[PDB]
Write a protein that binds this ligand. Sequence first.
Ligand SMILES: Nc1nc2c(ncn2[C@@H]2O[C@H](COP(=O)(O)OP(=O)(O)NP(=O)(O)O)[C@@H](O)[C@H]2O)c(=O)[nH]1
Ligand SMILES: [Ca+2]
Ligand SMILES: [Mg+2]
Ligand SMILES: [Mg+2]
Length: 166
Amino acid sequence: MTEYKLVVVGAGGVGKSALTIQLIQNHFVDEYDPTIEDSYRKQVVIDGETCLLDILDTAGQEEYSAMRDQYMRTGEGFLCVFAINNTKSFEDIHQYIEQIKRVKDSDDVPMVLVGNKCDLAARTVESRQAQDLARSYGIPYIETSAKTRQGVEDAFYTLVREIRQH
Ligand SMILES: Nc1nc2c(ncn2[C@@H]2O[C@H](COP(=O)(O)OP(=O)(O)NP(=O)(O)O)[C@@H](O)[C@H]2O)c(=O)[nH]1
Ligand SMILES: [Ca+2]
Ligand SMILES: [Mg+2]
Ligand SMILES: [Mg+2]
């Protein structure tokens, strides 16, 4: 059984915890409790193979930026999340990737760029704008809603594939 170490990263309130919790636990967290750092673990079959997903729910608040370095070393693949109604989080996520590539000293780090909250109509990040950013990194772009589960399995499982195809 292969184990995959996924880390979910991005700015505060973009839906990292709701995305993780929707995948692992199949419900939507409506309330907003900022995360320090939580861990989840779950046995899944992906492309015929049983594997263990280890998922680190990280902090979006800047006050815990200090602990980013240590989880960027451990993690095998990184789900890079912004909210399509939050232009600042799209600008920010660009920064998170550069930090990962730095900390890991590779421009070949398994990653998926995720535009979350795609159920909201207050979109200020157009899909083409995120596509352009993903293209420059060689990584997939996938839109999701943690509310409706749209794209949630696809996003996380794409990241496993990126890691396992690394
Ligand atoms: N409509 C909608 N709301 C969402 C979605 N994902 C998260 N939210 C909402 O946005 C708020 C913040 O979500 P949360 O997952 O806690 O964000 P976070 O990125 O983990 N924040 P932190 O970095 O502080 O831990 C919550 O009220 C949650 O219900 C989504 O896909 N759609
Ligand atoms: Ca709920
Ligand atoms: Mg959270
Ligand atoms: Mg615009």
